[PDB]
Structure 1
Amino acid sequence: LHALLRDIPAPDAEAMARTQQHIDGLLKPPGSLGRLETLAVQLAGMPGLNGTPQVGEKAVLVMCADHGVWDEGVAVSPKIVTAIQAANMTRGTTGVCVLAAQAGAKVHVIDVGIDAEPIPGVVNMRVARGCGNIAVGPAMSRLQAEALLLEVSRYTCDLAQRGVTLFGVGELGMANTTPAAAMVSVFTGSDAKEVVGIGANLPPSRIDNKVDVVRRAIAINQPNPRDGIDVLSKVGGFDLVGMTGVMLGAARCGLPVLLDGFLSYSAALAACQIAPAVRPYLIPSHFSAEKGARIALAHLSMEPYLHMAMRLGEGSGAALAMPIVEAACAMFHNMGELAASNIVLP
């Protein structure tokens, strides 16, 4: 693990300078394609990409797990929905499934801690049958967190060996917006009231209780904001841990990862805390409708491309942004050049 973190490659400034120059020569006013240009250059700096903006195979990794905090009445969805939906993920009927198919991406469902019998067809990396209730103690042990990070990290880099060049991260876990909010509060230094949202249609009344639960989790566990693993293990969850693991894995592999929504932002804060070298590999997708999204994004210094008021999760926003990534590549490789048309701009 220390190794892993040690070996995360820096971005290739040389490939990036070459990309920039190429882009500037394209058939358009310089910088006119804005964020599409910046993205392309960003991709070019990624070592696993072979010095150019490219997209080969695509995969969305969905981390599923249950949370003990569900018992605190912080979620209106029945707990069993985690297991049901995970199964549905196998049949291609879920939101992420439909969107991924549209993007030509494959979905990998990973069980990191569902509180139910094993689901056939789902990748088994189960830590336990749901994590501890963060309101009265830690979600899991440091060991458990570190092990899972390692395991998902490897699984991720391994997919690279098989042609995957672009990853997307997602989750599934009833009540997971609670630990997500706690992490955000901790890493950001924001008060819980500011970052706690309605999650999956939590009624406005019930909010207060959610905020109190978050506060309790923090007071009780005293996670250290300077230690991302500390935070994850104390006030996070298996699903959140697995997401951070995908990010660590892609980075080590020198490949890009598309974030999803709120849950993903929380995992991204932790990953960046654990290894700042991770940052350049992350790509935002959309702007989550969750209340604490703006704050989380600000701390990551990211501006998402899509404003869809989405708040489903599962990696649906990541899938939806994949075509954008491919567009930056198409632009880069298929557009004609100014010089060739004899166009000279001041």
Structure 2
Amino acid sequence: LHALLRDIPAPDAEAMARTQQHIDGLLKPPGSLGRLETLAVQLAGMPGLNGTPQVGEKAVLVMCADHGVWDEGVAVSPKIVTAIQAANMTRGTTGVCVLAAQAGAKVHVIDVGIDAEPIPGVVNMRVARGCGNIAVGPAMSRLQAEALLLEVSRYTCDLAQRGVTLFGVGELGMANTTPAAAMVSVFTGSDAKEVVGIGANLPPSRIDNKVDVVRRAIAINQPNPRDGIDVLSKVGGFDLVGMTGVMLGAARCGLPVLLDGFLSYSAALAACQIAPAVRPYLIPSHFSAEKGARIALAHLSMEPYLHMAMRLGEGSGAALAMPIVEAACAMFHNMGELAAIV
């Protein structure tokens, strides 16, 4: 894993300078396409893209797993809903599947810890049948976290060798907004009440319990904010670790990753703590309607492109933003040049 992290490439400043010059010369007032221009330059700097903003094959990786903290009454849906929705992912009927198809992306469903029998058609990388209950101890061992990080990282970059150039990250796991909130509180130094949300329609009367569970998990585990792996293994979950792995993998591969919502923000906070070199490869998609979204985004220094009040997860937001990345490439390659007005 040390090797992996040490081998993440820095952005290509030379390709970026050439990209900036080319964009400035397009048939439009300089800087008029705003963030679409900034995005094109960012893509140009990613080594896996061959010095130019381009999109080949697209893939959304959905990390599925169950959480022991579900027992603390922090989620309104029965625990089995995780397994059910994972199966539905193979049938193409879920929200991320429909939005991914609309964007021409392929969805990869990965089981890193569902508490049910293996689901056919789902990639098997399960660590255990659900992680430990963070309210009374750690989610997993540090060893388990590192192993999963490495496994998902290799899987992600291997896809790159099959033509995939743009990744999207997603998840599925009842109760996962609880460990997500705990991680955000720890990494940002914010109080749990300020970053704990309603998740998947948790009744307002049950919020107090959720805030209490989050505080207990932190007090009992004492996660070290300066060590992203320590945080993940203690108050995170397998799905959260898996998303972090996709981010580390894509960056090592020198390729872009589209973030999703609240769960993905907590995973990105961990990834950037573990390896700052991953930051340049991260691309925000939408601004989650989860309470702790603003705080998490602020510490990541990111401003999402889409304001849709979305809060579904699954990587649905990441899929919705893919056309935006393609548009920046289309702008770059298809617009005429001023030289061809002063």
SS for the counterpart of 2:286 is: coil
Kindly, what percent of the aligned residue pairs are identical? 99
1:191 and 1:174 map into 2 onto residues whose CA distance is: 23
Deviation at 1:297, TM superposition (A): 0.1
List per-residue Cα deviations over 1:252-304 (Å, max 9, x = no partner). Answer: 00000000000000000000000000000000000000000000000000000
Deviation at 1:8, TM superposition (A): 0.1
2:103 and 2:322 map into 1 onto residues whose CA distance is: 6
List per-residue Cα deviations over 1:157-182 (Å, max 9, x = no partner). Answer: 00000000000000000000000000
Runs of 4+ more than 3 Å apart: none
Deviation at 1:132, TM superposition (A): 0.1
List per-residue Cα deviations over 1:132-171 (Å, max 9, x = no partner). Answer: 0000000000000000000000000000000000000000
Deviation at 1:307, TM superposition (A): 0.2
Deviation at 1:22, TM superposition (A): 0.1
List per-residue Cα deviations over 1:69-93 (Å, max 9, x = no partner). Answer: 0000000011000000000000000
Deviation at 1:39, TM superposition (A): 0.1
1:190 and 1:327 map into 2 onto residues whose CA distance is: 36
Deviation at 1:128, TM superposition (A): 0.2
Partner of residue 115, structure 1: 115
1:52 and 1:121 map into 2 onto residues whose CA distance is: 35
Per the normalisation by structure 1, the TM-score is 0.99
SS for the counterpart of 1:4 is: helix
Q: What is the 5 A alignment of 1:1-346?
A: 1-340=1-340
Deviation at 1:112, TM superposition (A): 0.1
1:137 and 1:307 map into 2 onto residues whose CA distance is: 36
List per-residue Cα deviations over 1:106-149 (Å, max 9, x = no partner). Answer: 00000000000000000000000000000000000000000000
1:302 and 1:324 map into 2 onto residues whose CA distance is: 16
Deviation at 1:184, TM superposition (A): 0.1
SS for the counterpart of 1:205 is: helix
Deviation at 1:324, TM superposition (A): 0.1
SS for the counterpart of 2:102 is: helix
List per-residue Cα deviations over 1:216-240 (Å, max 9, x = no partner). Answer: 0000000000000000000000000
SS for the counterpart of 2:85 is: helix
Structure 1, unpaired ranges of 5+: none
SS for the counterpart of 2:63 is: strand
2:218 and 2:103 map into 1 onto residues whose CA distance is: 39
Deviation at 1:326, TM superposition (A): 0.1
SS for the counterpart of 2:204 is: coil
2:297 and 2:80 map into 1 onto residues whose CA distance is: 31
2:105 and 2:61 map into 1 onto residues whose CA distance is: 10
2:68 and 2:78 map into 1 onto residues whose CA distance is: 13
Deviation at 1:47, TM superposition (A): 0.1
Deviation at 1:41, TM superposition (A): 0.1
1:199 and 1:86 map into 2 onto residues whose CA distance is: 18
RMSD: 0.5
List per-residue Cα deviations over 1:45-85 (Å, max 9, x = no partner). Answer: 00000000000000000000000000000000110000000
Report how many residues are paired: 342
1:199 and 1:47 map into 2 onto residues whose CA distance is: 37
2:163 and 2:3 map into 1 onto residues whose CA distance is: 24
2:21 and 2:79 map into 1 onto residues whose CA distance is: 53
